[PDB]
Design a binder for these strands. Structure first.
Lengths: 96, 249, 735, 716
RNA sequence: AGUAGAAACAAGGCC
RNA sequence: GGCCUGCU
């Protein structure tokens, strides 16, 4: 019914910025090594760990949900997954 | 015979004898309303809560000698445990339905004659003729109108003496009704209800309702007639008018 | 997309969809425990709004009383109870001048009523604080107990059967050295003068439940029986007065209120020319009852009753005299819990005077510390102001005087104002040639209100242009708009009985269609839902279903027995024939022609053991406490059927020391039934006289045996038997 | 003079006359000659009536003493000697039985032979004037009148004297005994003329004694007595006293109007704290349904058998294990309770006929889960005063909690359509009037719109659950009871179906007050993993109980299937109000019908059909990141129904307070938008009144967020 | 524990 | 263990 394609992951330095996107054809979750999958943002609603640092936006016209991540820290190192209401993307690595 | 006999039996016991002796007639009402039962604040909640019990209603003791204690499968119909502050016994709701399927039967032909107002309403509606519904803004203006369509041009007190003389001819006292309209009403309602055995109190209440004029303030648009106000809910609305002509006309 | 109903107001005006803003589909807030905290808070608040008054100690009750009347004028917008005697007397004088003959006439009718009123009128009231037992009891029970105590003490003027004589006895009781009361645990206890004075001047405090529209709970009060007659007379006078005032809206219903509001707004705006601007203030009064001093009501009534018989003035003045010295019982008490030892305790409120303050929190500790000086014999003196709207009508009179004081003849300025007042709520239409004029007019109205001990709630009030306003949950927007959310709680089974519930439900649907502009399809849906709930509540299902219940067997056999099953009542598991056209017809009469004669006779049988009728007042009257309003009574059309049973009573009296009340109830009811069989008109018209029961009963036995022989069943043998049995009961009453 | 009535007359007559004296309320000490005269009248009445009997013939039998027999009939039966009420009772009874005419005044006796009344009066004056006097007092009278007078003479009309003459000799001997006994006394200076018909009284209500002193302490500060204050009031006249105090009063006492503009209103502040948790008594958005496709109706059937049959329809059961703990309770108790429920369900399945209602064993597991024997024992204060821990019940403002995004999504999906019809309405009288046809068509349209709505499913769930819980509490007060959550719907194909969400175990429910709490434990199947929104399930314990396979194009999902288990509670009032959730349908559809009628008052025609089919007109019913979104009338119906359902589900005092204090501000904002120059006296006070209602309830916080969004979109 | 929210329930009393 | 009450 919906298929979800993520993009924009990778390797970034402490204090840096990174921009994820999800094309659907809605929110972002992350899972750190040995930890449970946590909500990052959904569209707005935001985890306390990322408030004032990460901003989620949604273009309904193009069914696309961008996540702008600023002021990145080593504790934000995770696999980041898009979700749409549940359908999940494949997951994109973010390494700070 | 009987009446004076339970009178003597009551006077036999000291407490009831004292109550009968020291209590004056005027205090009749007070002691009759003397009760420990508070008036319920939330009737719906407890009616929905009591009906889930066994033996939730109350009935006179005589029920114990007209209805069997149990039905075919053994569901109990009444209990012998009396109410809190009365000699009546608590009984189950089935004892009602049982009374409607095997209880004693009578001749209810005179109930239409007693409940004149309701049957007149039914007759008026049965022969009514409806019309097209017209959709247009209705200017509802608030007016004082008479709701009772059978009022005989009498007030509460004015017709109360008539009602007593019709039902309780001996307790009238000084009053002997002067107006001849009251004379004819007394004659008619006396010969009509000469042997009706429903109850003196209900007969008096319904005569009061029928003869006494009553008035209330309501938002009306058109109509204004007594027969046209009882169906005010069906003929007038917020944006629609339903032409109607009761059976009387 | 996120759904948001409130955004609907961006297209539909607020008043056209105001019903959405009334969450009357859920359980209303209830209080759980004691109301003592609220009572203490109210007492302290009433006493501190008048702190700048003068203190005195009553020589009779020995309680401290605070008189703020003629006190320093307020210098802030906070609530103040410093009413000025001269200002209020002048306001009443102007009210009389604008309505000549109002006071004299109203006093004349009140004098007629007072001198022809009876004692039994006091029984027609809800719970009252009986001082014989120090608890709330039904009005009739408390009246009977007080009469018994008075007769035992030697005050027997009430035997005249006149309420004025009962009040004479009540006042004479105030001058007695030692009265005697009865207590069960029977013990005879002696009350001295001061203790009886305080017991007669005290009020019982409870917590108001089922109050929708506020986060916090409030406290309400119930007076005794000694003071209710004076209150009745004073309220009769006030009602007779307000009925002559078109600016009042308290003694009328809702539709009359709407009509008067429309008339006043049209009068104010229409008469205003193009040059004059008009503004409506939707005002609520903060702490209305706490700032109304009974002494000022005494002043108003003594001005009203000028040039009248002195006895009338005295009897009408007794009430505010007692309210000025009124005491309030703190309440049920306080319950403590100890989790370490895992126990709970309940201390009565009367211990608050001496109990240490280690158990109470900071707020309650401070409240008790502040209220202790006013504690006298377990009750707190509450002289400064009224507790809970006992003098509603006099307060409305004062508000109407304020409203009329701006008729442009007393303003002496271009601006002027009018409006409608109903205690604690008002709508004020003020016109003036310019915004400065409107501001000056509203300022002067507020200032004059503060001179009469009346405060305007600035937080719950707002002013706009005329054409849109609110009044007691009635929203006017170029014409009143229906709400239908205030009457939603009344769409279920009332809880009286089967026939009564059916008739009440259909009649409520009809009325809300007539008044609250309920739609046809909505009314049909309401009928369907009400029928469903009615069948599911009384276990009376259609009969053709297989829903097993405790009553599904007898219903099913009655169904299979009946031939014309369309005539069966819904109470007996029959089809529902109701519709928009049939909402004004009782169920029995609507199905009369369809019933089988056997079932019809079994149903409407006078000899049924279920139907019980007590008095003409309780035949077809049901007391339904409406949501957001005072308790109200409704006439419901119903036919006396076997379904008109009355439900079971509480039955918890059996575990209390007050267990003998049930035996007295049974004996009184037996005697009353015997009298009714002797005097059939006992119920319809309450008998009057000064003789005793047995005299009337035996003498009527004599005469009825006589005449019923002169034609009837009796025989000489039986007639003589009755005559000598009457003689026997005569000699028995001798000894 | 009273010494005469002390001496001669018998007690019976003197107390009869004393009660007649009390009758009309005049005192005996002022004028006693009336007492003597009327007591002599009463005496002649007796002596004339008694000693006179009749048998089956006429021709009265006269016996000096009534012998023991049934033959004790009295010739003349007395009228007077009774109260006015009874005298008129006898008058009316005689008239109605004898068919005679009713006199307007009081007679004295009745007789059979001549079947009529006797009005005996013996006056001081001679008979031949008093007779016709009382005759012209009585109008057109057939009652025969007979009077004596002291000289000894008798008279009567018709020359009629109704009984023996020796009795009349008796009467006049009695008469002259009276006369020449006063001769020894000497009373005729007034006896002939002592009564003139005085009737006057003044009502006296005198304040005296203690009650007077109280009146002296209920005056303004500078008054000393009620007399002086009343004199001052009577002498008071208006002389411009309000103006003087208005001028002297400080000018800081004002009601200045603060203009209300677009930039004036500020957004309502929401409380901050831990996220808001779930409060509902059952799962709303995460419910799962096990079905059988039976033909039974809503109430038709037996609960336990239907539940077991529905549960047997699912395969894939696994041994339950903890997934998300309660975080405050003992999850192993919940696990053991679930396994116990399964075991006892099988136990019922084995036996002969499924019981209509089952009772469960009271194991320690459900003893803890249902809170049994935890209420502190009630004791007396005199026995527990030295306990330091003894204090009041915790009475403080509830914990503060911030809004979470789950309630918004729950409401969003509570307004969505479904693949079933969750309302099966009852029957109504066949429509006879055209207006009834219009109403029926409108009602059918709304039922088609709202029946396939999650709000209706929630309504039915709540109604059924609360009804069953209340009935079980009232019936099985002591013993824990099992109740399967059942709801019956109808598919698109038309086949009826049952659905089993889970089970409820009701505990001890000895509910006396309307606020007393009955505790139960609720278990509900679901597929929503609780590891994604843990803060919404603070009070739940969630286990893993199986796996479900729903047909999907992605092979087949084989999702996990969890059990949400929690301890909840209700009260009689809450149960009663939750069993009347069907009035949410009313509220909503009344609002929609009011909209339709208001619009149709403009165009003189019913506008329902085009509203529901064309769907051209739309109302703002939500906001998307792109902007405000409008939906058809049906979506408005569903949205209002969901709002009412959530009002009934999350009801609380916070909701009422916020609703009132926000309706005030909504009216002010509407006045602003209508260009009506709104003004306020203290807007900060209103804001503080609104903000104090928002504490921890998810529903009220969501309403406040909606109000802030409406303000942001409005004021433009 | 839970319900609930300015104080309560989580049975009461009587033997 | 036995019995009483569920707005008093």
């Amino acid at each position: 019914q919906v298929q979800l394609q993520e993009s924009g992951g990778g390797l970034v330095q402490p204090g840096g910025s990174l921009r994820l996107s999800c094309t659907a054809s809605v929110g972002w979750y992350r899972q750190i090594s040995g930890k449970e999958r946590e909500l990052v943002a959904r569209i707005t609603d935001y985890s306390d760990s990322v408030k004032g640092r990460f901003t989620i936006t949604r273009d309904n016209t193009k069914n696309t949900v961008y996540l702008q991540m600023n002021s990145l820290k080593r504790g934000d190192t995770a696999v980041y997954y898009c979700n749409a209401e549940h359908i999940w993307g494949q997951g994109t690595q973010v390494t700070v | 015979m009987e009446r004076i006999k339970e009178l003597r039996d009551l006077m036999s016991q000291s407490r009831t004898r004292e109550i009968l002796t020291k209590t004056t007639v005027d205090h009749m009402a007070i002691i009759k309303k003397y009760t420990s039962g508070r008036q319920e604040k939330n009737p719906a909640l407890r009616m929905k809560w009591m009906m889930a019990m066994k033996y939730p209603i109350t009935a006179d003791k005589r029920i114990m000698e007209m209805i069997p204690e149990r039905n075919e499968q053994g569901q109990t119909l009444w209990s012998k445990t009396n109410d809190a502050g009365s000699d009546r016994v608590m009984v189950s709701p089935l004892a009602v339905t049982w009374w409607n399927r095997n209880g004693p039967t009578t001749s209810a032909v005179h109930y239409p004659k007693i409940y004149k107002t309701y049957f007149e309403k039914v007759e008026r509606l049965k022969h009514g003729t409806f019309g097209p519904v017209h959709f247009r803004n209705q200017v509802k203006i608030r007016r004082r109108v008479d709701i009772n369509p059978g009022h005989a041009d009498l007030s509460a007190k004015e017709a109360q003496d008539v009602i007593m003389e019709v039902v309780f001819p001996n307790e009238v006292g000084a009053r002997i009704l002067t107006s001849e309209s009251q004379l004819t009403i007394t004659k008619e309602k006396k010969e009509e209800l000469q042997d009706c055995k429903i109850s003196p109190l209900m007969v008096a209440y319904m005569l009061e309702r029928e003869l006494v004029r009553k008035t209330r303030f309501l938002p009306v648009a058109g109509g204004t007639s007594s027969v046209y106000i009882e169906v005010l809910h069906l003929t007038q609305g917020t944006c629609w008018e339903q032409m109607y002509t009761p059976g009387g006309e | 997309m996120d759904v948001n109903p409130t955004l609907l107001f961006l297209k539909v005006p607020a008043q056209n969809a105001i019903s959405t803003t009334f969450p009357y589909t859920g359980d209303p807030p209830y209080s759980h425990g004691t109301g003592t905290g609220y009572t203490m808070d109210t007492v302290n608040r009433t006493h501190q709004y008048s702190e700048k008054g003068r203190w005195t100690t009553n020589t009779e009750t020995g309680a401290p009383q605070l008189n703020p009347i003629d006190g320093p004028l307020p210098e802030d917008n906070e609530p103040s109870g410093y009413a000025q005697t001269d200002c209020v007397l002048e306001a009443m004088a102007f009210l009389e001048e604008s309505h000549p003959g109002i006071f004299e006439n109203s006093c004349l009718e009140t004098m007629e009523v007072v001198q022809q009123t009876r004692v039994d009128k006091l029984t027609q009231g809800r719970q009252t604080y009986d001082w014989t037992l120090n608890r709330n009891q039904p009005a009739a029970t408390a009246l009977a107990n007080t009469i018994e105590v008075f007769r035992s003490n030697g005050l027997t003027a009430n035997e005249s059967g006149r309420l004025i004589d009962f009040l004479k006895d009540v006042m004479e009781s105030m001058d007695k050295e030692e009265m005697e009361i009865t207590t069960h645990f029977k013990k005879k206890q002696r009350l001295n003068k001061r203790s009886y004075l305080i017991r007669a001047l005290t009020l019982n405090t409870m917590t108001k439940d089922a109050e929708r529209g506020k986060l916090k709970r409030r406290a309400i009060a119930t007076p005794g029986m000694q003071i209710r007659g004076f209150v009745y007379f004073v309220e009769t006078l006030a009602r007779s007065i307000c009925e002559k005032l078109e600016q009042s809206g308290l003694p009328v219903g809702g539709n009359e209120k709407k009509a008067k509001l429309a008339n006043v707004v049209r009068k104010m705006m229409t008469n205003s020319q193009d040059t004059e601007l008009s503004f409506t203030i939707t005002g609520d009064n903060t702490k209305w009852n706490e700032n109304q001093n009974p002494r000022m009501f005494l002043a108003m009534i003594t001005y009203i009753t000028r040039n009248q018989p002195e006895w009338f003035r005295n009897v009408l003045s007794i009430a505010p005299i007692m309210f000025s010295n009124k005491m309030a019982r703190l309440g049920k008490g306080y319950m403590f819990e100890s989790k370490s030892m895992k126990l709970r305790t309940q201390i009565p409120a009367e211990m608050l005077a001496s109990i240490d303050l280690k158990y109470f929190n900071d707020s309650t500790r401070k409240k008790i510390e502040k209220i202790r000086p006013l504690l006298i014999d377990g009750t707190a003196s509450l002289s400064p102001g009224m507790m809970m709207g006992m003098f509603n009508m006099l307060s409305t009179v004062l508000g109407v005087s304020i409203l009329n004081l701006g008729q442009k003849r007393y303003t002496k300025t271009t601006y002027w104002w009018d409006g409608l007042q109903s205690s604690d709520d008002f709508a004020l239409i003020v016109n003036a040639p310019n915004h400065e004029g409107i501001q000056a007019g509203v300022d002067r109205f507020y200032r004059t209100c503060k001179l009469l001990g009346i405060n305007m709630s600035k937080k719950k009030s707002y002013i706009n242009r005329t054409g849109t306003f609110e009044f007691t949950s009635f929203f006017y927007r170029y014409g009143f708009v229906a709400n239908f959310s205030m009457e939603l709680p009344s769409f279920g089974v009332s809880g009286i009985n089967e026939s009564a519930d059916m008739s009440i439900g259909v009649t409520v649907i009809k009325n809300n269609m007539i008044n609250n502009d309920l739609g046809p399809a909505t009314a049909q849906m309401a009928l369907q839902l009400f029928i469903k709930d009615y069948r599911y509540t009384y276990r009376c299902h259609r009969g053709d279903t297989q829903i097993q219940t405790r009553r599904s067997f007898e219903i099913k056999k009655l169904w299979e027995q009946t031939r014309s099953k369309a005539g069966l009542l819904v109470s007996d598991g029959g089809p529902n024939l109701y519709n928009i056209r049939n909402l004004h017809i009782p169920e029995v009469c609507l199905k009369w022609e369809l019933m089988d004669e056997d079932y019809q006779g079994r149903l409407c049988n006078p000899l049924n053991p279920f139907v019980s009728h007590k008095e003409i007042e309780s035949v077809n009257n049901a007391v339904m406490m409406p949501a957001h309003g005072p308790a109200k009574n409704m006439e419901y059309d119903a036919v006396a059927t076997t379904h008109s049973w009355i439900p079971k009573r509480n039955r918890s009296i059996l575990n209390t020391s007050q267990r003998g009340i049930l035996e007295d109830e049974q004996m009184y009811q037996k005697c009353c039934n015997l009298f009714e069989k002797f005097f059939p008109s006992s119920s319809y018209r309450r008998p009057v006289g000064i003789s005793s029961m047995v005299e009337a009963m035996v003498s009527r036995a004599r005469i009825d045996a006589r005449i019923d022989f002169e034609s009837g069943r009796i025989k000489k043998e039986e007639f003589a038997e009755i005559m000598k049995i009457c003689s026997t009961i005569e000699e028995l009453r001798r000894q | 003079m009273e010494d005469f009535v002390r001496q001669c007359f018998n007690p019976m007559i003197v107390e009869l006359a004393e009660k007649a004296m009390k009758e009309y309320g005049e005192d005996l000490k002022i004028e006693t000659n009336k007492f003597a005269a009327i007591c002599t009248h009463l005496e002649v009445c007796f002596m004339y009536s008694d000693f006179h009997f009749i048998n089956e013939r006429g021709e009265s039998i006269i016996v000096e003493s009534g012998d023991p027999n049934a033959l004790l009939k009295h010739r003349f039966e007395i009228i007077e000697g009774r109260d006015r009420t009874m005298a008129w009772t006898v008058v009316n009874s005689i008239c109605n039985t004898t068919g005679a005419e009713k006199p307007k005044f009081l007679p004295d006796l009745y007789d059979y032979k001549e079947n009529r009344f006797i009005e005996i009066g013996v006056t001081r004056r001679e008979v031949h004037i008093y007779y016709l006097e009382k005759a012209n007092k009585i109008k057109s009278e057939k009652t025969h009148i007979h009077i004596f007078s002291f000289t000894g003479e008798e008279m009567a009309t018709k020359a009629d004297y109704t009984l023996d003459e020796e009795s009349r000799a008796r009467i006049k001997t009695r008469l002259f005994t009276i006369r020449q006994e006063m001769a020894s006394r000497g009373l005729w200076d007034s006896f002939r003329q002592s009564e003139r018909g005085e009737e006057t009284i003044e009502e006296r209500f005198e304040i005296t004694g203690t009650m007077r002193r109280l009146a002296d302490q209920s005056l303004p500060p500078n008054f000393s007595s009620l007399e002086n204050f009343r004199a001052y009031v009577d002498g008071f006249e208006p002389n411009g006293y309000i103006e003087g105090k208005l001028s002297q009063m400080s000018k800081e006492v004002n009601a200045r109007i603060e203009p209300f503009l677009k930039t004036t209103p500020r957004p309502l502040r929401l409380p901050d704290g831990p996220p808001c948790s779930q409060r509902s008594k059952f799962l709303l958005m995460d419910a799962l349904k096990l079905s059988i496709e039976d033909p039974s109706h809503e109430g038709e059937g037996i609960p336990l058998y239907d539940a077991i049959k529905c549960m047997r329809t699912f395969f894939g059961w696994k041994e339950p294990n903890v997934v998300k703990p309660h975080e405050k309770g003992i999850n192993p108790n919940y696990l053991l309770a679930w396994k116990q429920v399964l075991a006892e369900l099988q136990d019922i399945e084995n036996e002969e006929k499924i019981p209509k209602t089952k009772n469960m064993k009271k194991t320690s597991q459900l003893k803890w889960a249902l809170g049994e024997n935890m209420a502190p024992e009630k004791v007396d204060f005199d026995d527990c005063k030295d306990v330091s821990d003894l204090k009041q019940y915790d009475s403080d403002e509830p914990e503060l909690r911030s809004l979470a995004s789950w309630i918004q999504s729950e409401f969003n999906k509570a307004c969505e359509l479904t693949d079933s019809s969750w309302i099966e309405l009852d029957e109504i009288g066949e429509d006879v009037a055209p207006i009834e046809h219009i109403a029926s068509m409108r009602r059918n349209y709304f039922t088609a719109e709202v029946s396939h709505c999650r709000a209706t499913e929630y309504i039915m769930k709540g109604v059924y659950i609360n009804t069953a819980l209340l009935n079980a509490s009232c019936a099985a007060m002591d013993d824990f009871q099992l109740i399967p959550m059942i709801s019956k719907c109808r598919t698109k194909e038309g086949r009826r179906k049952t659905n089993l969400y889970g089970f409820i175990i009701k505990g001890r429910s000895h509910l006396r007050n309307d606020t007393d709490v009955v505790n139960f434990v609720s278990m509900e199947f679901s597929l929503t993993d609780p590891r994604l929104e843990p803060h919404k399930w603070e009070k739940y314990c969630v286990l893993e109980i199986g796996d479900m396979l729903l047909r999907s194009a992605i092979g087949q999902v084989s999702r996990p299937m969890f059990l949400y288990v929690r301890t909840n509670g209700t009260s009689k009032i809450k149960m009663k109000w939750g069993m009347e959730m069907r009035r949410c349908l009313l509220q909503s559809l009344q609002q929609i019908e009011s909209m339709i009628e208001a619009e149709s008052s403009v165009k003189e025609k019913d506008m329902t059909k085009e509203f529901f089919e064309n769907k051209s007109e739309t109302w703002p019913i939500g906001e998307s990141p792109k902007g405000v979104e409008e939906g058809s009338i049906g979506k408005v119906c569903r949205t209002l129904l969901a709002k009412s359902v959530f009002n009934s589900l999350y009801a609380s005092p916070q909701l009422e307070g916020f609703s009132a204090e926000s309706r005030k501000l909504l009216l002010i904002v509407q006045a602003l938008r209508d260009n009506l120059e709104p003004g306020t006296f203290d807007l900060g006070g209103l804001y503080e009144a609104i903000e104090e209602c928002l504490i921890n309830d998810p529903w009220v916080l969501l309403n406040a967020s909606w109000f802030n969004s409406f303000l942001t979109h409005a004021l433009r």
